[PDB]
Amino acid sequence: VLDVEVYSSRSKVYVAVDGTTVLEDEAREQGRGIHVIVLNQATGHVMAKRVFDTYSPHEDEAMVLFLNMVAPGRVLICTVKDEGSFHLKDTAKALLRSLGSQAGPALGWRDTWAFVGRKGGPVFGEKHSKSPALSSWGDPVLLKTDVPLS
Amino acid sequence: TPTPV
Numbered sequence: 001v002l003d004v005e006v007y008s009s010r011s012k013v014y015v016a017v018d019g020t021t022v023l024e025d026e027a028r029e030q031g032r033g034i035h036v037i038v039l040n041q042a043t044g045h046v047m048a049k050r051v052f053d054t055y056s057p058h059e060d061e062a063m064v065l066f067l068n069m070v071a072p073g074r075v076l077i078c079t080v081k082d083e084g085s086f087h088l089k090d091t092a093k094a095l096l097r098s099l100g101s102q103a104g105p106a107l108g109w110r111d112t113w114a115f116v117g118r119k120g121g122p123v124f125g126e127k128h129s130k131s132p133a134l135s136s137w138g139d140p141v142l143l144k145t146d147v148p149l150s
Numbered sequence: 151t152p153t154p155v
């Protein structure tokens with residue numbers, strides 16, 4: 001199994017696999033949105049890493065087009081930095097739901113969200129915290145879960 | 151870049 005850690009918050013995201021951090025971003029000016037990592041399901045190696053600023057218009061379309069080309073079976077990791085919902089439209093939301101995500105489809109303004117799941121298979125872990133007020137953010141969430149190698 | 155509200 002892979003030891004996977006996924007952190008989502010206003011100011012910082014990080015992802016680690018088996019003790020190696022494969023993503024860390026705590027910029028103010030950059031990195032906003034949904035960070036997406038694709039792992040090889042047999043080795044845990046990172047095959048692709050992206051960030052879609054879904055706070056901004058049309059970035060969710062790019063995320064959908066990227067997710068479309070991921071082979072069924074790959075491990076997906078999603079994590080929000082700062083804000084990932086403002087221009088997250090219904091098609092992207094529906095796609096995340098079809099990926100088995102509970103909170104993705106329901107993602108709201110300045111919510112936090114961390115997700116690990118196989119494309120075409122089960123979810124391995126998910127956490128979500130709601131912003132309590134418009135000028136506030138969801139509570140940071142720290143998801144630590146085991147991912148079985150295929 | 152739009153901002154609420």
Ligand SMILES: *[C@H]1O[C@H](CO)[C@@H](O)[C@H](O)[C@@H]1O[C@@H]1O[C@H](CO)[C@@H](O)[C@H](O)[C@H]1NC(C)=O
Pocket residue numbers: 032055082083110152153154
């Ligand atoms: C958009 O700008 C408004 C001021 O013009 C703020 O009151 C809103 O809260 C929005 O603020 C922007 O929020 C995003 C998402 O949290 C953040 O990444 C931007 O830095 C922030 N922009 C500003 C100017 O506060």
Ligand code: NA
Pocket residue numbers: 008009010011112137138139140
């Ligand atoms: Na936060």
Ligand code: NA
Pocket residue numbers: 134135
């Ligand atoms: Na504000």
